[model samples]
Target: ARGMISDRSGRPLAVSVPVNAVWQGGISLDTRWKALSDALEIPLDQLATRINVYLARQVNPAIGDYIRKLKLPGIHLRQESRRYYPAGQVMAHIIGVTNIDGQGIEGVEKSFDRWLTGAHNLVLSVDERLQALVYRELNNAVAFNKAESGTAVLVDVNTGEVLAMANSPSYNPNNLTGTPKDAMRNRAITDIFEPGSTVKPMVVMTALQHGVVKENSVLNTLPYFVNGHQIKDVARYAELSVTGILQKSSNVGVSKLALAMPSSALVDTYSRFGFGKATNLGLVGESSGLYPKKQRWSDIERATFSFGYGLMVTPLQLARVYATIGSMGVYRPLSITRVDPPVAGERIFPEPLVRTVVHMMESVALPGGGGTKAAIKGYRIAIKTGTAKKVGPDGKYMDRYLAYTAGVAPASNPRFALVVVINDPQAGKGAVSAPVFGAIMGGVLRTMNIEPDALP
Candidate 1:
């Protein structure tokens, strides 16, 4: 099938490859069976033990046409087209899988079943070179941290096209017999998590948009308490500028700033950013995440919501938020299929505020910032680091944490937005996710031939 799923460069991700299969028909057992057993390297007695088992079932054609010339009885050769994945598990979740009858079961194989079954091929926005790069790095990061699972997503900031969406614990769609169902799920879009500090950029953008704060506005960040709850930072600081607040991910500064705004404004900001709703990617089992609409908020809820708590977002949603910031406040619906000219999107925030927030994020990836590990040579990246507490079965925050590193590259003129999330990592906060983001973003910049923006 010429129209099978392929990458941006036309390399087939899922295609039908020809194969020769041998099947046994009803016939009297004879000495010819001995030669057949030898050709397949099966023990003669073992083969004899299952005469009925091998009857009418397809077997390997190891010798191809050579076996047919042996004059064997009750045996016939049949040519078949087996659905094959050249990239295997590396592209499993994206390309999805089909059944024995070639029916679409998951992923694009299922999402575009109508078009696929009609003999039309699907051309994805994914780049094979970048997909391989992201998958390898995500696998290594998960293994290095001994984390339960992880996901990495990279998208074209301008077009809203996914460049790579790699999930750890991946399985080969070609062989799904023993593969776990969890491995088959696309965690990037299906699983939801508290975005933690990654949403801080948007928080600051909202504050600026509503006149709650200015670029150089100073805030008292020293240990502050809000409604009987104590707000704290990594370390105590008496005061920090608005930009400094984002650079250091100051919970106190953002919380205080968010509380100054009306709840309606806060909810509007989140809604405009595409939180609490599905990205409409049409992936099976996709989660829209938890963003509650409230007419009023408790003092505690207002503070926590400012710093990305009390709400949930999928990794893809989080990435889209960053993509919007990188694209100067334009929010575009993501595209899996290729488009000749990228569709236009809605303008959400003013360009000035978006640029300011992006610059603040870039500071987070530079020297003396929390996301320094995400920095790349000769390229400036605007990123944020997040370490979120996982809720225990008893509904209390636990020691287990989900680390995240998400941002955009070539900050001066952004092109790509990437996000990495690692669940229950043993490594330090942002330790596992940041480097994985760097590796994937670095590879994408080079692969796409985008010139470096920072000086050597």
Candidate 2:
């Protein structure tokens, strides 16, 4: 009847409260049910006969406590815990809920059943404080933008442990009655969406690693037509360096560079970047992903992919991609459960090249950059803004948009990778997602004791 599970810092997440709860502690195992039922206003007919214990099961705790001192013949009140959530709905989707028998039914409660039931204490990767911040900001962002729903993921680069995986429209673990199915959905790991331009960093990495573009290469980011398909930027940025292309979020420049390399090379590079695979959270119903790999592409099909329109990813998977960049090209699997000494990872890109690519992304949140709103004062951020069109039931792309801002913080020596995505809004690129990203990451940096890298 307790939860010892906590974040990396021992913040109680699923523990029960100290206040004594009401259960039918037996004075007589063979006592009649009517005395307890009539006194407590509970089940009047055919209550369970197995234990001779008709509990305070569904009775109001206040009423139970009010009647506790009356000395009713059969009913009794005993000290117990009733699944106290420290953050309540803030962590409902993550901590999950327990059955009436104190058995875990979902979320971390189900994932680490033994730890909760077999041991006195259990540790988790979710920081309660960060989770709260994430929920608050993401909820506001979704409401403000009038979007369908949103999800956010924040992970430690070194440890590969998710610090926060928060979804808006969350339900209360304390009260599941009348809760809609939509509110209980954990969209962060369950649903998938096209990452849009958030994957541009990987695209550039592909181009650079393939040697189609040098670190200092410059491209004309002006509007152009490729095989009768228009490739353009928000404005005519006539000349842009490689870094500027990313900082400006130049579709024209990115498309040009991507097309210069072979499509086969692009597919191979994307697959190796951890797309089309699971992040290894081990959660049931977690989506691996939707990847695009056409053997032969039309000019427009390849063009759409040049800017990451061909990929669909979960918030956790998108966060892992940025985490890999933050880890300086090391691809690491994310853990919802706590990991010690930071798990070992694999090298997905050459260290030197990834550093340069990270540098490219840093300029995106600086002044005059496309993701300027994504900046948190006194911190160096490597962020990209993305807006992908949603598809209607008719199988056509709709005008509504899904906005995303994804990257790492304190870029000098990266610490965390956060991704915020809001669905079905007028959010062009980072319009709505960027500010939410800034708010959550700013609080996260200070709360977690991360030294501000660029405060100077």
Candidate 3:
């Protein structure tokens, strides 16, 4: 049994196509073995061994044919249906690949093997054109920036549909040989990193929800120390409004806000945002990302955690957080398959608080904001930038950084959530990830015919 996997628009991603495989019929000719082996590009000695094995077992060998001119008495060809990926590496991670026997092995193929083999068709949330664009941009960013790897995810905010999820260093599922194992990883859902300052919006939202801060509350962002570990902002601010704190992405500001609350409260807020858990998208090898368990926290740990350290999050999780905000505090479960009737979500935060946070995040993409590079020409975007230092195996922070930008487009009327992550980039968030975010979001908005909220 075979099934076809297509995009929402019926564009084929993975399908079973008929192909010929060479087999051995109950006879063997030693003299003609060389001709057949040469035709198949298989070594003569190896072909002989395979022929002998098949002959002794009285079974046909499933060797794929290459040429038609070379005919042999002992060698025959059998028709078979093999799984083929028409999108090649563009949709590799999402559609996945199968084994020579047409058994699902990786990606959605592995996750939905039963339905795919038993059913005649399966459709996904992915848009083939959008997937190609995401893949192209990710590849360009990773190569141009000389970064280790990169991932980009776009989701339909209203429906919780994943429009496109692309990772650089991807490989063709059609040809697995010579492809590195790491290249096959779907980093958007499988890899985790410290999210740096991107979570500051959530921190501000939590503070607002708890009455610890009002929209116009002032924060003292001066350099301070927590348990002998100094906390400093990139630039000192004597005082900043809660909105300004988000605009500047002030580490000291968020740290102070976080310190005002108990560790359990902070952990509870993060959990509500879907951290410390797998997305349950049902993809194989998805990481849950690390979050400290409830325990007495050190002063330094608490402060650091406020600005997105002492924790890890998958790119998918980060995107979902933004999606939740864009959808007015409702956290909907993600769907890889095409969903009908639009799934409803649970409201975890007050709608007012979510709108306030989204509003404050808008400043971050304005001309003078921390994430200005992510701004679109004719659209207002609410974005947060992150540049997190990587920790080596020795447990010390290294020079490498994971640059990130996550946001929702046309902030006035949010429709999409996009997240971009650049691993071990040579530059900071604005230099790397922020620009990628702008380009991808800009393209998506234009292609989807989303109207501009602001006049150019």
Candidate 4:
């Protein structure tokens, strides 16, 4: 049946026009329509009925008249696939594209190519117009921040499909060539850096998942302490609660939590959450990213890893971990292929646990949470920020670090999961990363059809 384009006068705004469409100007029409009518096992009279009832009636009279006008003695038509990009850059990282080699290269391009590949074009769960709006916001955000690199991914919770993933310094796959090697990389998933406070939530989640603590579990949120190892808060000497640990990004609290879980469990959870393991998004040279295997965890390494240290994960994987949490504990494999409709996958998290975490995440966006910046201008959002110094030789750390924010919006039952990461942002500390994320997220929320507060 044709789509409903107008109510006053039934019409299809778009329809397939076969290249081999027959007409007196070229091939034959009766034979072609008859062939299709016959293939469907309908009599010519019934076929005409089906066309008129299911197609023509819903089609514009203009289009019907146009078809009749084209029936000048002979004409035929055949079906073909056309790729559409409604979201454009907003989909750059998720609905990835193929390389010249005919290989699925990145994002959903690599992940869902099998479904999107032969014969059929998949319809994604994403809204095209929404994706465009998100891309525009992200682009503006990049421009506003004067950022060197940035990334954003949006996910739908009820269904596990990613709606949109955008990034700065990205290119059009159709025109993707001669760009700098750095420009071609997908900062969302392929690039790995220290997660900073972003890793704090996962640590808390892992701790809670293992039954080592409660939402009210107490830990030292103080700035400096030496319990066999020195631990510090993001700032200095800030006393905190279990909620405060996350709200404040307390290294001390997380280190205390890490002490509760074994190194094996921590590493195992990381692997289960799409770290170390490849997301299989089909990007050429996409990094699986570095993480210590269960066998490789030492005491100090484990401690540091607890707070987003000594581990490397693509920004994509990290975002997905949060997405799964937002999705009520199911971990669906990430995808990017085009389709007529969206698809589903195996569950990666438990619904109950995901709900609990989502609730906690929501708390982070409220009055006293860690994610005030995560709040959208007109919508509720939950998010966490991370900033980790690059580890150097032994106890030393590099001056440069990675800054990140991971969030979900319309928090009651999240419609989207977003992640933004900044590599080597400057200006004294990682504080600037928070505002940048806020700007990108604010724009995205507004663009995806959410109305703004109208004042700010």
Q: Each candidate: what lDDT?
A: 0.81, 0.78, 0.81, 0.58
Ordered list by TM-score, greatest first: 3, 1, 2, 4
Q: Sorted by lDDT, highest first, which candidate order results?
A: 3, 1, 2, 4
Candidate number with greatest TM-score: 3
For residue 276, give model 2's deviation from the true position in Å.
1.4
Q: Report the C-alpha lDDT of model 3 over 293-352, residue by residue, as the tens digit.
A: 657788888888888887888888888888988998888988999999558898888887
The TM-score between candidate 2 and the true structure equals: 0.85
The candidate, 3 or 4, that scores higher on TM-score is: 3
What's each prediction's TM-score?
0.89, 0.85, 0.91, 0.67
Candidates 3 and 4: which is better by lDDT?
3
Tens digits of lDDT, candidate 1, 256-332? 88888876666787788788877887578777888776666888888888888878877888889888888899999
lDDT of 2 at 189: 78
Q: List the residue pairs that clash in candidate 1.
A: 3-121
Candidate 2 residue pairs in backbone clash:
none
> Which segments of candidate 3 are over 4 A away from where they belong?
24-34, 43-46, 53-76, 391-399, 427-430
Clashes of each: 1, 0, 1, 32
lDDT of 4 by residue, 34-59 (tens): 65454434576765554341222222
